[PDB]
Structure formats: C-alpha cells, structure tokens
Design a protein around this ligand. Structure first.
Ligand SMILES: CN[C@@H]1CN2[C@@H](Cc3ccc(OC)cc3)[C@@H](O)[C@H]3C[C@@]2(CC[C@@H]3OP(=O)(O)O)C1
Ligand SMILES: CN[C@@H]1CN2[C@@H](Cc3ccc(OC)cc3)[C@@H](O)[C@H]3C[C@@]2(CC[C@@H]3OP(=O)(O)O)C1
Ligand SMILES: CN[C@@H]1CN2[C@@H](Cc3ccc(OC)cc3)[C@@H](O)[C@H]3C[C@@]2(CC[C@@H]3OP(=O)(O)O)C1
Ligand SMILES: CN[C@@H]1CN2[C@@H](Cc3ccc(OC)cc3)[C@@H](O)[C@H]3C[C@@]2(CC[C@@H]3OP(=O)(O)O)C1
Lengths: 467, 467, 464, 470
C-alpha cells in the first residue's frame, strides 16, 4: 500500500490526489483521502478502484482543508472497507497504514475486553487506529501536548507487533506519523517553504511523492521514530521505540518501490542497476560455456537490470517484448506482452525478469520466445528464490502456491520449460543494495530466507493467515 | 423523516427496503440502512436520493444480517443517517425529530467526554449522548435495566421531540419516544413459526402492514423498547412525566391516510376535517354562490369530497397532478398540476387545499383556474393559518416567509388573488381529530398557536434557527 | 407510446422535455428527443428508462434548436432517422399489421436495410423512400403530402406519427381510421410569430401554454415549415373516425380531450352505466360500501356509489413510489378499517390476466371483509390488440374461452360483473355522438382495418 | 486513429476488443465496435473514452457475429460523432476511417446537391461512407459482385482527396478494406487457419500478432480488399497512379516499436535514428562536453541508448514516467507525466534526447526540471527534424500558429526553451534511417518537415488562396 499526509497552508486536496497518483503503483484496489476543513470537521472520500476513478469533481470540492492524508490499497479483502479509517472519540482521529500487524487477533480481543472498543472490519489498520485511540483516551486535559501524543505512540509500539508506516490526524492538534521499530515499511519526511512565514510539511511512503509536489526532501523517518506537526506549522520529533534498528524491506528495492525513489539513503535505480551487475557477473561465471546471442528484458522493471547484465556479458541488449500501456478485460499474459518476432528468430536468448512467484508468467513468456523462433531460451531472476510468505505488508500466494517451495533450480526450470534458469544470490542482492548505504547492516528478507526480524512468527500464525 | 427497525430471524435487508419505500413520503432527500451480520459487524449503506436509487443489487447483497434499522431523511449535502460509533460496544441510531438544545449537547460531549461531532445532525448528537451513558457501566454484557437507565439519563439531558431506533452490538435493538409523544412510532410483531417471533418498529403503521407484521400498539410517550438478539422483548417507561401530545400536522398532511397514529385513523380524521370545514363554510359563506368544489390533489381529495357533501354541491376533478415530475435545467406549479378546462369554464369554483405556508402555490393555482375560465375562485384551507416555525422535526421556511405571519385572512386573500378565503379553526381541527380518540386531550400545534409543549423554546433560539 | 413535436421560434428542448413528462403515462420503458439546430443538424438523445432518468443536463445542452420531436415508448428506441434523402426523423405511436411485407418491399424494391424490429424504422423508410422520388429542391407542401398519401397506400394498421425533414419543417399524420390519438395546438408570441405543436393528448398542449386547435383528422397530414407556415391536407382514401375506445377507459389522461370527448366525463358516464346495471342485475345485492382501486377507478366507483346510494370510501392506498425486488402488496395497501366485517364492492377498470384482481380480493378478506364483489369498468377482454397497445397474449387472457362465473371463481370473488360493451360505447358516445364506431377489437374482436380479415382468409388457406 | 476488421468463423467481439487495446495508442478519445449478427443486422457500440471504459460486459453480449470492425479515435462532442458510422441504404454499410480528407467541403456539397444525402457530423468518415454508398447506389442488381464493389472504390478514389486507410462492411456481402493512392496511412492484411480461413486487417501488425493471425503483407497503395461472408478473398488495384509514400512520422513516434509498417521494423528504424543523430552530434559538437545521455520516456529511450553508444558516453535514466496520470480539477505541467531522478542530474553536463519538438512547451519545462535537479549545462537532441508545417493527412497536432519552429531558426528556438544547446535530426539522415530497412521506399510523407504535400489538391488550393490576397 501507499500513504501520504500533508500539513499545508493552502488547499491540499489536489496535492494529495497528485501524490497518490505517483504512488498508485503501491496499490490499485482502492484509494482514500481525508482532510480537515475550517470547521475542524473531517471530510472523507474513499472507494474501490484507481485514484482517477475514485475521486471525481464533486468529491474534491467536498474535500476542503489545508491538512489531510491519503491512502492507496494493495488488496489485503477487496469488497471490505478501505482506508483511511476514522473514530470520533477521543477528539476525532483518522489513520492510514502501510504494513501488517502480526498480533491483530490478540489486539482485537484486548480492545473489546479492556476498552469495550468495537472493530467492525478485518483490517488491522482499524485495530491500529483504536490502539492509538485508547491510549490518547487516557489523557483528560486539553489541548494535548506533544509529549502526550508521543507517549501514546510509545505505548502503541509496546502493544503492537509487526511492520507499519503510519500517518494520522487529530482534530484540533495536527498530523502524526511514525515507523515501526525495525524500519521495515518506508516513510520519508518533506518540507516546502511558501514564504518566510509559512512552511508546509508532508510524509509519504516514497520520495517521489515529495518530488512531484516541489517538496524539499528532509530525510527518512527513522525506525521507531514519530513525527508530530501542529496545525500552527510546528515540527516535533521523538524516538518512541525501545530498541530501534534499520531492517528496511529488501523487496522494496527489488521491485515494489519506484526507481527514482530514495529509501534510507539508497537510490532504488542505482541499487537495481547493481543487481544487474551482480547477476551479470554470476552468469558470466556459472554460464561460462553457454552461447548467448542477446539479452531481452521483460518490461518494465527488469529493463535497466537487463541492460547492465548485457554490459557485463558483452552481449547486445534488445527490446524483444513490448508491454501494452493499456490492458483489457476478458468477459494469458499475451495481452500485456507482445513479442517482436524479428528479435527471437534463430537466436539463443537470455530473458531477464524481476522475480518468479507462481511460475505461470515465466512459463508463458518462454513459450512466446519460442513461438517467436528462439533456439534456446534462458531465464534469469533479479531476485532470489521466493520460498516464504511475507507478513509485513506484502501479500502473496500461500507457501504452496510458490513454485520454489520444496523445489530447486533445476526442477523449477523444467516446470517452466526453460533451457537454463538462474536466480540472484541473496547475499549478492544485499551487497548490491548495501553498496549505496553501508550503514544498513541487515535487511528484511523473510520471503527469501524465512528469517523474521520481529521474532513472533510460527507455522501456527501462517496456518491461521491462510484462513 | 421516517424510521424503521426490524429484529427478526431472517434476512431483513429486503423487508427494511420495502418498509422505507412505504415511508418514502416522509423523506426523499436521503436514505440509509444498517444491519448486523452473523459476525456481529455493522453493514452500512446510505446516500442521497430516493430509496430506489440508493440501494442497488450490490448494496443489498452487502447488507447481510437478521437485524437492522432504516431511515429516510427530509431536508442537504451533509451526511445522512443512520450514524454509527464503534465505542462503546458499537452502536447505531436513526432519529426522527429535532433537538432544541443540540448546541448545548455538542459542547458537553466535547468538554466532558472528548467525543467529536462531525455533523450538524443532532442524530449524531443523540447517538453520542446515548453511547456516553452506556459508557458509565463496566460490566458485560449489559442488562435490560442498564440500557433503560442510560435512555432515562438521556431524556433528562436532551430537549425537543424525537422518535428513535438503535442497535447495540451483542445486545439487540432499542427504540424510544420523547416524553411529550410528539413524534410517531409504532410497535409490531410477526410470528414466523411457533418457536420464534420477530419484532419491528416504524414511524407509521403502514410499514407494519406492508411487511405483514401484526400491529401491537403505539410506543408510549417517554417509553423505551428493547428486543434482545434472542427475540426477548423488554419494555419500560424512561421519562418522568409522559404525556400524549402527538403532532397534529401528522394528521393534517405528513402521514399516509391508511396509517393509525395513537389509535386515530388519519383517513377518518381528514374526513372529519372536511366535515367541520364544510360546516364552517355553510354558515360563514351562506350567501355566496358556488357551482362546484374542486380538490387540489392529493391530500384534499377526500377532504373536498366531504366538504362537497356538507354543502350539497357537486364534486368534480378540476385539477390533475402529474404522477411524474422532471427537472428544470439552468441551461412553475403547472409542471405538477394541470387544469381540466371544462370544469372551470363559466363557474364559481371552491378550491380545497391542505394548507397555506408561503402562499406561492395558492396564487398560481388560483390564476390557473382564472385562465381556465373561472368567474370567481374561493380557497378553503384544510388547516388553520401557519404563523410559527416547527422545532420538532418539521422543516419549514423562516417565520418571515410565512404569508400568514403578521397578517390577517383578508390581507392574505388579496395577495394570493382569491375572491374568498377561509381557514379551518384550530379547535375544529382538534375536535375533528379527537373524535377518533378522546383520550388525547392535547396536541402539538406550535405552528398554529405558538404554544410549545416542551416549554423550553425561548426567543433567540427561534431567531438563532434562521441561520 | 406517446409522441410530441414542436415547431417554435425559441429553444424547445425543455418544452419537449416537459411535454414528455405529462405524457409519461404512455410509456416508462424508454424515451427519446431529437431537435434540429442552426446548422441544420440532428441533435439526438434516446435511451431506456423514465424521461427524468434518460435526459440529464449534459444531454439537454446538446439538444439545441427551435424545432424537434419527442417519444416515450410503452414496453433500439425512437426516434429513428435516416441521412437520405435530406435527413428525416420520425416518432410513431401505433402498430403496423403488414410490417413483414413492408420490410420485404423496402429491401427488394429500394435496397433499404432495416436493422431493428420496430415498425417505426419501417414507417420512416417507407416515408423516406417516397420522398426519394423527388429530385427538385426545396420540396413543396404538395410533394410531401403526396409522399404521405403514397405511404398510406402501402402501410396497414394504426398509427399516429410526427416527423421532421432537414431544411423543410415538421410533419404529422394520422391513420385512415383515426385509431391512435393526435391533437394540434398553436401558440402566438407576436402577430408575426406563431408556434405550433402536436401531441398524443391535449394535456401536453395545456402544460406548455399552447392553445388547443383541433384533433388531427383521420388520414389527415400536418406540415409546418421552418418559416412557421401551416399546411393541412387529407392524405387518405375514405377516412373514418374509429378512435381507440380503450384510450377513454384507461390509457389516456382524464384531463385529455380526445376527438372532442372529455376522458374524465367519459369515465364518469361509465360508472353511471355500470352502476345502473348493478341496480338491475344485482337487486338483491347487500353491500355496505363501494371501494375503488387506485387510481383510474376512483371517480368511476364514486359515480357507482351515487347510483347505488351506498357510501364511497378509500379502502386502498397505492404507494406513490416504486420498489425494486432483488434476488401487488408492494404497490397497494389496505386500509383495514374500511373492510372489517363489511360486504364490499370493489371497482377496477379492467380484468386481463385475472392476477391483480385475485390478490386484491384476497387483500379485502385479509382486512376482514365479509363478502367481496368486483365490478369492471371495461367489458370482457377476449381478443388481442394489433393497433399499438401492449397487452399479454390471448393465451394469457382469463376471459377468453371462459364465462363470467368461471372467471369470478378463478379470481375468487363472491360476485363478478362486467360493463356491457354497448353501455360503455354510449357512455363515450354521449360526449360526441358524431363518433359512430370505435376501435374496440379487444372486446368484440372486430378489426376495422380491412387488411386484417383477408389475413385470416389466407391463414385458412394454409390449414388445407 | 486506429482501425481493425476481422472476418472469421467464430465470435469476433472479444477479438476486436483485444485488437483495439493494442492499438489504443493511436487514439484514446473514443472507441467503437460494430458487428453483423446471424440475422444480418448491425450491432453497434460506440462512445467516448478508452476501449476498456467504452465496452462493458452488457455491451459485449450485444456485439454478436463472426465479422466486424473496430475504431479508436484521437481527440477532436456527442457519441454519434465517433466511429464507425452507418447508413441503411443501400444494403446497409458501415465504415471506419483513419486519416483526413482535404476536400471534405466540396464533397459535402456534391452529396447534398447531387444525391440529397445529409451529413450530420464534422467527421469526414461519414463523408467517406456516403461517397462509397452513393457509388454502390448506381447498381441495380443483387447481390453485388466483387467486381462491382471494386469499381465503386475506384470511383470513390477519383472523388476524394487526402490520406486514408479504411475498413467497411456491407450487409449480405462481406468486409471491404482499402488504402489511399499514396499509401500514407498504414494498413496490413493477415490470416488465421482454424482448420476455413479467417482474415483481418489493421493499422499495425501488432494487432495481428496479439490475436495470433499470420502476417501476409501490407495493403498496397490504392489497393482494395474484399472478403465475403463465405470466406473468399479478392484484391484489386483501385487507384490509377498508386505510389508508396508512407507517413514518415509513423516510424518516428506514433507507431508501436514492434510493428512492421511497409516491411520496415519501427524499432530498427528508431535505432537507426539514434545512429544518424549520434553521428551528427559527434561531428558538429566536437568541443562541447557532456557527462551522460538521458532519454525522455518512453519513445526516445532506445534512441538515446544508441546515441550514447555512438558518443561513447553513459546512458542513464534521468527521467521516470508516471504510468498513472489523473484529472486536474478546476477551482498543465509536465510533472504530472514526468519525474526527475535528482541523483542523475546533480553537477553534470547532461544530453537530453526527446523524440520531437512541436510547441516547445514540454521541452522548456523538462529542461528546467534538469536545471533544478543540479545539472550544469543541459543540451537537447531531437530525434525528429524541425516541425514547421501542419499535417493534413490524419495526424493530430496543435494549430500551425503554435509551431515554435516556424519562421525561426535553431538558435532562436534554443533560447526560447532555454537550452544551452539544441540539435535536430536532418530530414535526409532520418529518411536514410527508415529507408535503410526497405530501400524500395523512395519518398515519404513528411510534410510536417519540408512542407511538401504529395497530394496535388493541397498545393493547388494554396495558389487559389494566394489569389485571394489580391
Ligand atoms: C514484469 N514484472 C512482473 C511482476 N512480477 C511479479 C511482481 C511481484 C509482486 C509481489 C511479490 O511479492 C511476493 C513479488 C513479485 C509478479 O506480479 C508476477 C509477475 C512478475 C514476475 C513473477 C509473478 O509471476 P508468477 O511467477 O507468479 O507467475 C512479472
Ligand atoms: C398538494 N399538497 C401540497 C403540499 N403543500 C404544502 C405541504 C406542507 C409542508 C410543510 C408544512 O409545515 C409548515 C405544511 C405543509 C407545501 O409543500 C406547499 C404546497 C402545498 C400547499 C402549501 C405550500 O405551498 P406554499 O403556500 O408554501 O407556496 C400543496
Ligand atoms: C388500476 N390500475 C391497473 C389497471 N389495470 C390494467 C390496465 C390495462 C393494461 C393493458 C390493457 O390492454 C388490454 C388493458 C388494461 C392492467 O395493467 C392490469 C392491472 C390493472 C387491473 C387489470 C390488469 O391486471 P390483470 O387482470 O392482467 O391481472 C390495474
Ligand atoms: C515523450 N513523448 C512525448 C512525445 N511528444 C510529442 C508527440 C507528437 C505529437 C504530435 C506531433 O505532430 C506531428 C508530433 C509529435 C508531442 O505530443 C509533445 C510532447 C512530446 C515531445 C514534443 C511535444 O511537445 P511540445 O513541444 O509540443 O509541447 C513528448
């Protein structure tokens, strides 16, 4: 998913709309925008579909105010309620959330038993809003001070487990934003000076959101850190986690994040290029005695990666596939992709793709290369084998739907009908990313090695999540 | 506005939809339905427009549950009912009427409970006052006595008129009525089979008939109803000094004729209105010559028929109301009514309308009769002069827009351009209605005499309302 | 179905919209409007649904022009149009009984394709085909009337039409039997500018402030040029006035004047006739109250109560709002105080399938009524209508093949009585005795158009 | 715009939907499909918006038949102003068109004055449909023979002027398709053998690929195609002096890279464009020092890669295209479609490569985006030559009064867009770049560059215009 919040001095409805559009790649199932008008009342608009579908003219006019947050959903269901969520007591709080709680079932029971707070959905973003809400509910003075809010967030970080990048608003106070104690989910802080007296603030899941609005990049929101921006335009920061550490989602760099984004001081584009350098060198070694004629990227994530791989192997780079800018319904990847036949005929081709989950896409893309007249079809995956399920925001097939589960490269290869299959090495992937910011010692790579940094996941929770 | 709530053992989504459709006359501006599904979670759908527009197939599929409440609003671009709060327990409420101390109540909710009110609707205020009272208990689940206690404390807090219906998660449906019994609310039951019994409440009895529910009785003034999730019915008075002062205007116009409010058939009442207006015309207009009595559809159709009987004159359909009415694009009573030319030609006509508020409609209708070739046009209002604003759930123009305000009958006659004008006496009206149930000794007729039963209506508020 | 055409000096999009609303009772299935702008082009908007739902603000801005026509269809929509010759659009209320023959001729003789099943597109093309035979420009009034006269010789059945021709003006005509209603109205702005309009009922004329001129005579045609000139002419051989009798019974508006016959006054007379018959044939009948079934039979049952000397009371209340059902009680509600322990006389305007009556009678007993009797304002309906009236098949008609008692027994009534055909006729004829013979095929099975009987004769030849 | 026509033995609604989608790049303003059902009747669905928006499930179920045509239109009112159009007489004819008629006015008059046929829209597609119809109206037999139809198209070609690639259907006959005498607008023919042979035609070969049709050839300039309801194929030359003058801008920008237009791979052509441009920069920009070559997504991506290869400089993605753009609500910057990767500009002499310059608006903003990103000197290379003239052969572009390269020389344009350096592709180099993939193409349609219009009526009307000045 993708979130965004703006504490401005002027109407921010169009701004959030534009910000979400550059973040539309993080979720396309639903979208939402909530603002605070001149009467300290929430204006909400949220539904299913793309941002351009959800927000029509009449909706934007209703979304008055200089402060507001937005959210775009990556499914998990789809027919369920979308974010941001809202509660009237205390004060009136709204919250958008990117990530996943691992003890949501435990928290839902506490909120009812200990607070008589009802949770109407299966979204753990509503659970998060209420956990944060019940803690704010313990104060009885007004207005709240920054320390009360930071105390509430600190108390929330003790109760909840998992990964979360959050942004929220409180009526008559301002905007808050915080990151989990592991820095798994991305979150950046921005700034924009209108004049010497007025400065706007915004947070977003990616820096591209900051860029497209003309917001000056400040920095990443630190792990376990919380931001608070009063409606007077004042910035308060505070460490609200006990033992914070930078374990950024590695797969953000591999695929999900935008290439022109900078996450934890790491250029997504550069790191992604470095992935090609690693994978290219590995291919030069492991496939030394194989004859390859051309490197053909599977658009669009693997384009710059495949280019570097070609640079290493000294082979030519060629646009063998074309992705259609638009796609239609069927009231079958050959509707997204089309093979430039002249680039496959009587050639040994190396296809480069970002990853392999189920193996369905890969099998078909290989068929297309052969139907185009390719002698041999070799495939390379920019990311290592994906054998374990993510529980930090990335939703994926059950561990059994994964083709790499209980299988090895040669078996996975034979199923997808490739002459050769080669995965990126997890350590090479780490080095490729670490090269841009060595301060980062360990990433979050559960989908690869099955090691969860939160330390609270068993087969029991995994079995549960399936149902 | 119109309200409905059904506590049954079957999908009530369709039954509430049908219930609101027979109540659609009570409000066309907005509609809402909320239910409690098998997982004890609220399913909500509410928007602007008519019931037929608001609820499409996909919405009905969502509204699962064996218990729910409905609402149809009479005004406008604001948020509609029913409203919902997730804490405590999870409550929802639909309300018909008005709170005269809503501003006071909104302050208390904020300063004392930190509960934010996001809407100008006092139905959200009434929802939060109630929720805040249920908040004082610390056990679970609640007993019938606790719910009744909270409703009692509510009545001691809120002023004005109100008929409500609500749902508390894991408890059941509750419904109550203001101490003065101003706003309509009836209780009904249906025996599906010997083992289980369904219950429902609604604004008028026609909703009970439509669904096939047996009419039990009117909800007593200040009384509260509580149907558990197990179908157990609880009843208890929650006001200190209950009185039956039903809205007189429900009888004059707003309620359907086949409805029985407080043991009074609206139809039988409106006949008696014609009986006493005809008798009044017989004496005070004895010398005048009229050739025919013509009703202005459709409330006065049976009233004018009675007036015709008493006068011994012919009753003829002179006006026809267009069953379909369209828009007037920005790119007037004639688009709703049409004169049967033959019925007016060379005749002294007596027009019978249900009321006179602004006086605009009356003027145009008289002019239509003139264009239709009428020598003289006399207008008889089935209701007394309207001089004072209603603060109990009836939307009307400011006291200044009322033509009968600060004027006398003949002054009104000249402006609307009639040769003769006569109103029914307020005491004739009361007798006409009381003759169906002599038990009721007093009515809510502040729009006629300016006597406010709650007594808590002072100047300033009356002048504040014009905002 | 209902049609309207306006030839004015000012924008008519709103006017046609308002006219269609008061005619909305003639069709709720679909609606369409087409106008001609200053560039002499057709602006069209048509789709399924009510008039209020079909035309939104964005459509009305497209419907520019001082002339145009509208249509509401009783369950592709109208109007249709063709580009050659000149550009012709047409809306039609009625039905063609030789549509298959006409469709065959248009293809073999003129190479004109028909893409829909609507005989409005057929009628439009027959008319357009005739206009194609002229090569001079502009066409004159005589040319157009000849084209309409030629059409009347080819087509068969009942029809009230309104049409427009690019760069010429509006035309409207009526079938040789005057079965489907069509009226003409005017409206003076100044002495040199006069607007004209035509419609299915006079209520459309009244609602717009147009002066009623006269019924369009059977077989007659109307023509209004762009310059606002009126031409009339008889375009049929041996025209006759055989207006639809059922228009007066139900379909038409009570405040409409069809062929100089007030629909309202007509429906009163029917009650007078039906009330007098009950006094004679049901002299032993013991009823406590006369109850109408909303909304057509209200002023009929009122008259029936007068003739019987019994009281009249609103026993049923129809819901003003339609309610969809997902995957009669919905529209009618019984005032259970007017039935309780009473012998009631229910008055409905007609019985077709017998479904509505049966359930309504059950609703009467449910309300505690002792005996439920049923009077029908219209005679037994035993035959199909092929003249532009949507009714279920003859196989679904309950009165067909069954007698009065058997009918009464299927709907479960203690008493069933029908209006007599001749009594009904006199009721309507009393308003305008110049009308000798009505079109009432649904009742007696007599079809006035001569084309229909020969069709039977050729049907018999196939049975050999 | 884009067109497609399928003549098969199975339902073609989905097939045309899939075809229009891969041609969606040729026009996004409106779309329309029309088929002939079992009853030999026309089923039509057309309205404004993308293909995916115009065609919902309820519209797809009504589009029954085994033969039909589709259309996508670029931005021009009503839904009846979209294609295809349709006339009920004679026979029943529908037609979809990609191009532009240079004598639409005189054709509107002849149709009215001579045939009494009314034109209701501003689309000359409706004009083209009525011209072809009135010619078919001269015959008095049935059914028409393939020879009769071809004769009608021939007479049509002698009447109309301009550029066009059409596909049409005639009730009870089959699918017709033809191309203008100059072969300006593209059109390709394909087949599919299910056991019976299906046939389709489309603007680009990619439509054939995505549906699994085998590629046969380009429809020849002035040639016509006729496919009957029974699946018989006819071809005929209906132009008197047919010549191949393919639209040069198809290869530059508008055509899909994986399409083969007139035996020329669009992708190979653009690579060659990068070659010719890179070589020109190495010649005329000896001294100037750059640190990186940055393409402006997405057309110039592979072109910039080649230019960088030639220049021996690095290729880096300085700009990223927003794949989702939204509405800007009243109550238009290029930042909505483009974002800068700040790290790739900072303290560098960048060479930007855009496919073209029309108004100079986009270029100016993109140059500033580079400047604020940290770039020292920003150079701009255009894959296409100066655009100095309006296109009247079916290409949609701003009014000729907005063309920055008109009456202005390169250095004037450079300081208006605020570039440190500006360079255009030479038309001769560009022509050699495309003609290298198919030397038998001698002359292109590049009127937007040289102001040379291959159709004589244009140059003739120009002199008639000059006469009005006196
Ligand atoms: C060109 N880029 C595409 C996007 N790719 C991935 C992206 C992805 C999303 C979530 C995730 O979390 C675990 C991991 C990866 C998948 O959507 C698809 C397709 C594709 C590659 C492998 C998969 O196809 P599959 O192998 O399951 O059939 C190609
Ligand atoms: C045919 N029935 C209509 C309903 N009537 C009333 C109904 C009404 C609403 C609120 C109320 O509380 C004060 C009292 C009455 C008004 O809607 C209209 C029209 C009408 C009568 C007098 C008024 O017209 P106005 O005098 O303001 O121009 C006719
Ligand atoms: C009071 N409003 C309705 C008037 N009625 C008629 C009107 C009608 C329609 C078509 C027609 O063509 C021959 C003749 C008459 C029918 O719509 C329905 C319902 C109704 C009564 C008898 C019929 O129901 P049915 O007998 O088929 O069950 C009630
Ligand atoms: C990166 N892809 C776009 C392709 N471009 C062209 C495409 C084009 C359209 C019509 C035409 O008439 C023959 C020639 C070319 C123009 O749309 C725009 C924008 C752009 C580049 C130069 C122009 O910008 P302008 O200077 O007009 O503002 C960027």
């Amino acid at each position: 998913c993708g979130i965004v919040g703006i504490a401005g001095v002027m109407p921010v409805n169009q701004s959030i709309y534009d910000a979400l559009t550059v973040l539309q790649h993080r979720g396309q199932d639903a979208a939402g925008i909530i603002t605070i008008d001149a009467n300290n009342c929430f204006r909400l608009r949220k539904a299913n579909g793309l941002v351009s579908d959800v927000f029509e003219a009449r909706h934007m006019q209703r979304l008055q105010g200089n402060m507001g947050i937005g959210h775009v959903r990556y499914p998990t269901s789809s027919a369920s309620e979308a974010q941001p969520f809202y509660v009237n007591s205390p004060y009136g709080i709204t919250l958008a959330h990117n990530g996943n709680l691992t003890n949501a079932h435990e928290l839902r029971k506490k909120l009812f038993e200990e607070k008589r707070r009802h949770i109407n959905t299966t979204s753990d973003s509503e659970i998060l809003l209420n956990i944060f809400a019940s803690e704010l509910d313990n104060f009885r003075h007004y207005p709240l001070e920054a320390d009360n809010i930071f105390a509430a967030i600190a108390a929330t970080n003790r109760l909840i487990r998992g990964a979360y990048a959050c942004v929220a608003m409180i009526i008559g106070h301002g905007m808050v934003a915080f990151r989990d104690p592991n820095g798994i989910r991305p979150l950046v802080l921005g700034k924009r000076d209108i004049d010497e007296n007025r400065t706007e603030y915004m947070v977003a899941s990616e820096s591209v959101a900051l860029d497209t609005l003309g917001f000056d990049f400040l920095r990443d929101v630190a792990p376990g850190e919380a931001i608070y921006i009063t409606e007077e335009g004042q910035l308060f920061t505070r460490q609200c986690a006990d033992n914070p550490v930078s374990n950024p989602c590695l797969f953000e760099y591999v695929y999900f994040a935008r290439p022109d984004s900078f996450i934890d001081k790491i250029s997504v584009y550069s790191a992604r290029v470095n992935m090609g350098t690693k994978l290219g060198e590995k291919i030069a070694r492991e496939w030394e005695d194989l004859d390859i004629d051309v490197v053909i990227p599977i658009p669009e994530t693997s384009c710059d990666i495949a280019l570097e791989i070609a640079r290493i192997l000294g082979k030519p780079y060629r646009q063998g596939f074309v992705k259609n800018r638009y796609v239609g319904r069927t009231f079958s990847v050959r509707r997204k992709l089309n093979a430039n036949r002249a680039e496959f005929r009587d050639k040994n081709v190396l296809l480069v793709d970002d990853s392999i989950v189920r193996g369905t896409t890969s099998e078909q893309i290989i068929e297309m290369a052969r139907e185009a007249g390719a002698k041999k079809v070799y495939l390379a995956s920019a990311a290592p084998e994906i054998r374990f399920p993510n529980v930090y925001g990335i939703d994926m097939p059950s561990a059994t739907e994964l083709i790499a589960h209980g299988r090895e490269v040669d078996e996975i290869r034979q199923i997808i009908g490739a002459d050769g299959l080669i995965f990126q090495d997890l350590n090479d992937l780490i080095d490729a990313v670490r090269a841009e910011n060595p301060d980062i010692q360990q990433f979050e790579c559960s989908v690869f090695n099955g090691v969860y940094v939160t330390k609270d996941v068993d087969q029991g929770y995994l079995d549960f999540l399936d149902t």
